[PDB]
Amino acid sequence: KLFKKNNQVNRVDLDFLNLVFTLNDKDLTSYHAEEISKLTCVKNFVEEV
Amino acid sequence: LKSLSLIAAHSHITGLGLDENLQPRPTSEGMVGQLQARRAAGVILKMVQNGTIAGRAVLVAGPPSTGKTALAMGVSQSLGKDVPFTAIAGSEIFSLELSKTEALTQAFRKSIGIKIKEETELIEGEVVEIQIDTGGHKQGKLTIKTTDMETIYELGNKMIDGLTKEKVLAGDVISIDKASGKITKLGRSFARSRDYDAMGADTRFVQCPEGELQKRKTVVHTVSLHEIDVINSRTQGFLALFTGDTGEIRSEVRDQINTKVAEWKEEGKAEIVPGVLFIDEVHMLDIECFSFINRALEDEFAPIVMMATNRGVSKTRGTNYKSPHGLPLDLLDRSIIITTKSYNEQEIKTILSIRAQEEEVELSSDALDLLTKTGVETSLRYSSNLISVAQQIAMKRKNNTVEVEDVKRAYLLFLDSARSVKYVQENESQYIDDQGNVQISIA
Amino acid sequence: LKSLSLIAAHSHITGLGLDENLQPRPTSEGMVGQLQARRAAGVILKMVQNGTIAGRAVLVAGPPSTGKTALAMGVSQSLGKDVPFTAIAGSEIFSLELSKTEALTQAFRKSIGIKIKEETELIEGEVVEIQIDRSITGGHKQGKLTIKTTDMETIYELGNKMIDGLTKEKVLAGDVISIDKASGKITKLGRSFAFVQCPEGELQKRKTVVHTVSLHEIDVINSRTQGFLALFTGDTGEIRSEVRDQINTKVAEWKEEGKAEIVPGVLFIDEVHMLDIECFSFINRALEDEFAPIVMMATNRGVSKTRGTNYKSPHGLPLDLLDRSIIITTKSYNEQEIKTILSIRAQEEEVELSSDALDLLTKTGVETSLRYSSNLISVAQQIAMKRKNNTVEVEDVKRAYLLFLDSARSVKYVQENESQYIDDQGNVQISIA
Amino acid sequence: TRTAAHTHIKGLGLDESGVAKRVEGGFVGQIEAREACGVIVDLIKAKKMSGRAILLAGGPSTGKTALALAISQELGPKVPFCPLVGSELYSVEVKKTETLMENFRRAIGLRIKETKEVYEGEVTELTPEDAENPLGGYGKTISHVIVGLKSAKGTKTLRLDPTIYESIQREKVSIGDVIYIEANTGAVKRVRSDAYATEFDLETEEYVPLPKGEVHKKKEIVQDVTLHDLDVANARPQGGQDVISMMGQLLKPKKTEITEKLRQEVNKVVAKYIDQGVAELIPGVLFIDEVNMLDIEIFTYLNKALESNIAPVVVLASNRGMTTVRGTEDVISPHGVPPDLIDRLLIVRTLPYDKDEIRTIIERRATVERLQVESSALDLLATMGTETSLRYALQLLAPCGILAQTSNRKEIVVNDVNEAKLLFLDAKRSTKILETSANYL
Amino acid sequence: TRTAAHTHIKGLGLDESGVAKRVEGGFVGQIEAREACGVIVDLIKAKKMSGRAILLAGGPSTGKTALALAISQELGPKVPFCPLVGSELYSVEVKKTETLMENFRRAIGLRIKETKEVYEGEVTELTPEVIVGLKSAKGTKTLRLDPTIYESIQREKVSIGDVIYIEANTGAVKRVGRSDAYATEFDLETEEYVPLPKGEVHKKKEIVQDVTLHDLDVANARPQGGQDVISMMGQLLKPKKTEITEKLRQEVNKVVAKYIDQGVAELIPGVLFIDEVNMLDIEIFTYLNKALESNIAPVVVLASNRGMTTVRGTEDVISPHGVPPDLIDRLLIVRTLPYDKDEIRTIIERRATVERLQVESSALDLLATMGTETSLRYALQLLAPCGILAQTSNRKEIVVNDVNEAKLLFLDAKRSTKILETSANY
C-alpha cells in the first residue's frame, strides 16, 4: 500500500500507442490491418470539424 | 536514416555498385583504390546474385581499418533489400544454450531467402441492417448494402445461427467469406462515431469500401524457414519467435523443411533468394568451427561466407600447432583471397575530407594536411577522431573552420600510441605488473 | 516372444557349458577354452545363487580381444530367468538430472527385486445370450449377460457401473469372453467364428499371481506423486532418503513375516578401466552396504592413472579397491581355440565356408586379431556370393585381404608417407606431384 | 537448379558382378574404393551383420564425401541414411550417451503396411426393417439396416447390422453427403456435396463432388518410421485439460531421460508385430565423417557398442595420419584413432588421381556449370591444376567464366585466366604472404 | 538370509568402566580406538554439549568403518547415525553448503507429540454450493468441504455407498471404498466392500510421530497436503528442494523453540559421518572451518588416512590424512594400529563362524598365513569361495587343495602386478 500510488501520476499508455504488438498477433491478420490503415488517414473526421 | 541511426564511421560508403564495365575507377561512391579487390568483389556479388550456384567461398586478409567491414556493408547495400544480412561476430557463437555447430546452422538458415504466395476471399462493405420476422431465425435472409451491390443474401443452418453469432447492431461495415468462412468485424461507420462520445478501444470507425464486395485477394510473404521452424516447434510456438528459446533445432525438422521447400518450389508456390554470411576476424574462432564449415559449405543449400581476418602465423584455437593465418590449411584451400594494402597520402586526405563532410565538419588546407600526416604515420582512425575533437574545439573557439590551432591542441592533449608506449616505459614506476608490483610510495 | 536382432558377435555363445562340479569342456555351449575362467564363472554363479552373500567386488583383466566380455555375457545369460539383472558401461556413470553418486546409487538399487504374491479370481465362458434394458437418452439401465460354457446355462448380471465395462466394445451372442470380478476388465479370448469353439469346464476359476518390482522402482513410485511419469520419463533426481529408509524397513519386515519373497539381482559394470576416483570411493562405500548386488568389473590396460588422481595405480584401479576385489586374469588364445572360434562363428553365420577359408582364417588369427577375421569372413563370403556358389575359395579371401587393410598395413603406409596426410603440425597434400 | 561442388557424382560406376570401370558414373578412378563400397552396399542390403564399420584414408578431394553421398543415393528411401560429424555430439542439453542412443534408434526403421475396406457413395435413403419385438415388451425391433450408396458408375446398397442406427444418430448423416463404413468394423463416419452448394449464398458448410469408382474399394499405405518416433510418442505427454499433459506443454519439455523399461517394451511390441507379418524391420546406415576430433570416451563407448544386437552399420570417415588422438594427448596414434579401434576395424585407403582423370574431373565440372574453355587455355588450366590443386582450379574456373561473360565473352581464353591467376593466390602463396609482408598483413 | 561383511559386530563390549573385551561382539584388538569410541559414546550419552568432532585415522581393514557401525548400533534406534561420504555433498540443484546444513538439520532428532484426527464413515449426502455426510458405526456427521477439498471429493467418485478416510488436520481425503453394507448390489461387484468404520466419524488419536528439523522445514517450504488437487499443484510447482536461507532458519528455530517449550516435546542429538576427507576440496574444508564455529552444528566423525599428500582443492597444502592444517589443529586424532597375526587368525575365525563355515584348525591357520603374507582382505574374501569350492569338490571341510585352487584362481594385487611387467600388451 506504500508503493502503488504514483500510477496515474505519470503513466503513458503503451497499449494506446500500439506497442503491445507481441500480444496483438493472436487475433490479427495482415490484409485487414492494411485495409484499415489505407482507409484510416483523415478524410472522415476533419470534414465536420 | 529511416531508423534512429545517427552516423557511421563509414556512412558515405553505401554500395559496391561498380559500373556496367566493372573496371575499377580511381574514385567511386567515395571509395578510392581497391581496384583488383573491387573487381573481384563485383564478380563475387554477381555470382551471389546469380542464385543458381551454391557452395562458394572467399577469404579477406590485410591489416584492419582498410574498409573490410565497410567492404562487406557496401556489398550488402549493393545487394539491395529483401535479402537479410547475417550480422554475427566471432564472439557470438560460443553461446550457452546454442552450441557453435548448430548456431552456425541457424545462421545459415536465417541467411536463406524464400518467397511465399497465398490467396483468400472476403466480402467488403456489408452494411447489413438485419431485420427478420423470438429466435429460430425464420426466413433467415440478411440485407447487405455496400457501394456497388445492395441486395438480400439468403442464409442457412450455419449463418441463420451465425448471424446471431457476433452479436452486432448491424449498422457497420463487416466482412464475411464467400468460401464458407466466418464473420469478422473491420470497424463501425462514421455515423457510429458520433453516437458514442468516447468510443471503446474495440470500436473503431471506417468508411464503407468504395467498390464491390467479393474480393479475391492475393498475399505475398518473405519469411525465413527457420521462423517456420520456431513456429511449429511446439503446439503453440508463436511466443518463441522473439524470446530466443529455440533449443538446438533438431535435424529432422531441417530435412523435412528442405523437402517441403523443394516440393513447393517444384509446385511454383515458393522461389529462392540468395543469401550471404559474413563474420569478421575468423582467426579468434575454434578449430572445430573451421572443421565443421569445411564440410558444411558444400551442401546443397550452402550460401557463400565472407571470411575475413588479419592475424599472422599463429595457432588455430582448439589446437597447439603453428598454423597459416591462424587458420587450418583445409579452410585456406577451398576459398579465394582478398588482401588490402598500406594507405597512401592521396586517399588518406580524400577519405578525411569525405568523413568531415559526413560529420558536417569543415576542414581547411593546413588541418587537412596535418591530419593526413597523422593518418599516414599513424592510422587514419586517429585522424578520424581528431577531426571530430577539433571541430568541437573550433565550435568552442567561436569558429567553424578547423586549422593548426585545434589540431595542435588535440595533438598536445591526445597522445599517439607510440609516444604513449614511450611514456609507459619511462614511467613504469607508477604502473603495475602481473604480480601486483606497484610503487605507491613517492618520496 | 523372440526379441528382434541380427547376427551379433555375442549371438554365437550362450551359457558356459559347465558341469555339476563346474568342470570346463574344451568346447561346449559355444564357449571354447578358458578352463579356469570357466571354473571361476561357475563358482561365481553358485555363489550368487546361494543368496547368502552380498557386496563382493570382482575384476577381470586381460589383453584386448580376449573373450572377457564373452564370458561376462555368458555368465549373465546363465543366471536363468525370472530374476532381474542390470548392466551399465564405463560412460553412463555421468548424468545431469542425477549426480554420479545418484546414478551409481540407482544402478545398484535396480538389480535387487521383490515379489509379492496375491490371489486372483476370474469368470470365463462364452457370451451366447445378452439382454440390456437401456432407455434412449436416459440415465438408468440394467443388463443380463449370459456368459456361459458348454456345461450349464448361466445368465449373469451387472451392477451399477458394470454395463459400460461390459459394453465398451463389441459383445455378441457367441463370443468366448473372460472377465475379472474385482475389475470387470475385458479380454478378447477370440471370436467364436466369422474362430474358437465354445469352452468347456466351470465358469469361475481361481489362481495366484506374483508381481515383481525392483528396489529403486519401489523407492520412486511411493516417494512423490508425479513419479509415475518418472517410471518412463525419469523426471526425478536424488529421491529423499526418508522414503528409502521406510521402504527398506518395509522390505525387511515383509521378509521377516513372509508376505513376499526377495529376488536379489546382480549389477554389471564393464570397461571400468576409466572412471573417477570419486566413483571408486563410491564403490568402496557401497560394497559393504547391507543390501548390495554382486558387482563385476573389467579392464584392458595395466599400470595406468585412475581418473581424478595422478598415480598410475595397477589395473587402472586404486589399491584399496584392488585388494577388496577378486581378480580373474585371462591369457591369450590357443591356435586350436582360435580355429574352433572361427568355425563356430562361421556356423553361427551359417556361411558354408570351405576348408581353405577356415585355414586362412586361422592363419590370420595367428598373424593378427580375430575380429578382423570376423569381418574378412563376411567380405569373402559376399565376394564368393558374387560368384553365386555357397563356398569361399582362396581367391575371394585373397582378393578381400589385398583390397582391405588391418591396422599394421595402414600404419606403415602412413609411416612411409607422413607428408601426405594431416600430421600433428597440420599439413596435408592433395596433389600427387 | 542448384549446385555446390556436386550434381556430377551419381552412383559408383557399379555393375552386376561387381566391376568398376575407368570413366563412368560420375566417379573416375578409384576402382578399388568403388568396388569395396559396392560390396558394402550389397552387405547392407543383405541385412545380416550388425554394427560393422569402415574408415577412409587419403588426402583432400579423394572421394570420401563423394563416396558417402554415392552410397547414400544408392540406399534410396527404402533404407535411411544419417550423415553426421562427431562435433554435433557436443550436446549441451543432454549427455553424449543419450544422443548416441537416439541416433541408434533413428537408424533403426520399421515399415508398416495395411489395407482397409472402404464403402463409398451417397446415402440414397434410410429406412427401418421392422420385426415384432420378441423379448420383453412389444412394438418395434429393426431386423437390420440396408442403405443405398452411389459413387461414379458404381451403385450399391449396403446391408448391415441395425446397430449402425446409432452411427446414423451419432454422426448426423442427414441424407446423401458422406459415407465411411466397413463390413465388420462398421459405424458411419462423416466429413454436404457440391450439388447443393449453390442453395446458400454464403455459409460455413462443406461440399464435395460425386465419389468416383465403385462402392467397395481398398487403399494401400506404406510408411517407414523409426523406433525413436514411437519412443518419443510414448514419452511426450499430449492432451488437453488433464494436468499432466497441459503442465508438460507449459513446461516446454526437454530431452527427458527416457527409462530403458519403455524402450524395451517398445522393442518387444515392435518385434511381436513384425513376426506376425503386419510389420518388418529395415536398418539405417549412420555415417560420421571427420572423426579425428572424437575423444577417448567416445572411442571406448563405440568399441563397447560395436557388439549390439540391433546395432546398424556405422560408416566412419577421416583423413589424419601420424597425429595425437584428440581428447587427450596420451595416445599418439595413427588417424587420430587409438589402435584399440584401428586393429578392430576395416581400413580403406584412397589417393588422388592422374592428370587425365583430374582433367576429366575439371572438364565435367565445367560442363555441369555450363561454362566452357577451349583447348588453347584448358591445357594450361590442366597444367596449373596439377601444379596447384584440384579444388583451386574447380573453384577459380567460375570467376574466369564470369569475368569473360562480363567482358562480352562465353569462352575462356589465355588472357582472362592469366590475369585471374595473377590476382588470386592459394595456400602456399598464403604462407608466403604471411612470412613476407611486414605491415601486419 | 543374507550377510554383507557386517552384522558380526554387535557392540563394543564396554564394561561398567567403559573397557571393551578383547574379542567380543565382532572386535579384534585396537584398544586405543575402542577406548576413544567409548569416551565419545559416554560424551554423547551425556546429552549436554555439542559442536565437537574427531577423526579416527587407520589403514585399510583397520576397523574404522567397523567402529563407526559399532558406535551406530550401540547408540540405539531412536538416536540416528548419519552416514555420508565426500561424494554425497556434490549435489545437483543446490549448493554443497546448503546440503551440509540439510544433513545437519535432519541429523538432530526431535521427539514431538502433534495431533491428528480422521473422519471416516459412509457418505449420506453431498450439497454443492460442501456436505459430506460420513456415517460411521455409531456416528453420522456432515462436514463442510472447502472448494478445493470439495473438488478433491468430487474426483474421488464418492457416492451413496462409499467410505472415505479423510484426515482432519491435513485435510486430504482417501476413500476406503464401497460400503460393505451394500454388498447386495452385484454378485461380482468390482469395488471392494468395506464396512462402516468403528467409533464416531471424527476419530481422534494421540500420536508420537516425531519431526526432524528438515522435516518441518519441508513442511512449510514445500507443503505436502497430498491427495487434494491444490496440494497436487503445491507439490508440483516446487517438488524439489529449495535453497532455504538463514531467515527461514531463524523462523524455524523460533518455531521449534516454542514447540519444545510447550512441554511434551524434547531434543536428542545425533552423529554424522564422513569418509575419506582427502578427496574433499579446499572450498568445503574452508567453509566447514567457519561452520563448526557455531552453536548448532552437531557431532560428526571423520574417517581418513593419507600421508604427505597434497590436499585436494589445492596444489601445495601437504599434510597427513589429506586434511588442511587448520582443521587438523582444531580436530581430535584417534590412532589405530595395524592388525597382527593373532588378530588375523581371530578375524578369519569369526568371519567363518558368522558365514556358517565350520572351518577346521589347519585350514584356519593357513588362511591366517595368507592373511599375514599379502593382505587381510585377500584372505577374508576367500572364505566363501573356498567353502563353495569344497562344496563343489565334495568336501565339508576346507583342505589345502581348496585354498591352493583359490590362490591360483583369485589372485591378489601383488601377483597381478608381477604379471604386468611381462606382457606384449597391457
Ligand SMILES: Nc1ncnc2c1ncn2[C@@H]1O[C@H](COP(=O)(O)OP(=O)(O)O)[C@@H](O)[C@H]1O
Ligand atoms: N575507400 C574508402 N573510402 C572512404 N572511406 C574509407 C575507405 N576505406 C576506408 N575508409 C574509412 O576507414 C574506415 C575503415 O574501417 P574498417 O576497415 O571497416 O574497420 P575493420 O578493419 O575493423 O573492419 C571506415 O570507417 C571508413 O570510413
Ligand SMILES: Nc1ncnc2c1ncn2[C@@H]1O[C@H](COP(=O)(O)OP(=O)(O)O)[C@@H](O)[C@H]1O
Ligand atoms: N573363447 C571364446 N569363446 C567365445 N567367443 C570368443 C572367445 N574368445 C573371443 N571371442 C569373441 O571375440 C570377441 C572378443 O571380446 P571379449 O574377449 O569378450 O572382450 P575383449 O574384446 O575386451 O577381450 C568377443 O566378442 C567374442 O565374441
Ligand SMILES: Nc1ncnc2c1ncn2[C@@H]1O[C@H](COP(=O)(O)OP(=O)(O)O)[C@@H](O)[C@H]1O
Ligand atoms: N574421387 C572423387 N571422385 C569424384 N569427385 C570427387 C572425388 N573426390 C572429391 N571429389 C569432389 O570433391 C568434393 C568432396 O571432396 P572430398 O573428397 O570430401 O574432400 P576431402 O578428401 O578433403 O574429404 C565433392 O563435391 C566431389 O565433387
Ligand SMILES: Nc1ncnc2c1ncn2[C@@H]1O[C@H](COP(=O)(O)OP(=O)(O)O)[C@@H](O)[C@H]1O
Ligand atoms: N574389530 C573388528 N572386528 C571384526 N571385524 C572387523 C574389525 N575391524 C575391521 N573388521 C572388518 O574389516 C573390514 C574393514 O573394516 P572397516 O572399518 O569397515 O574399514 P577399514 O577398517 O578398512 O577402514 C570390515 O568389513 C569389517 O568387517
Ligand SMILES: [Mg+2]
Ligand atoms: Mg573490422
Ligand SMILES: [Mg+2]
Ligand atoms: Mg568382449
Ligand SMILES: [Mg+2]
Ligand atoms: Mg563428407
Ligand SMILES: [Mg+2]
Ligand atoms: Mg574402518
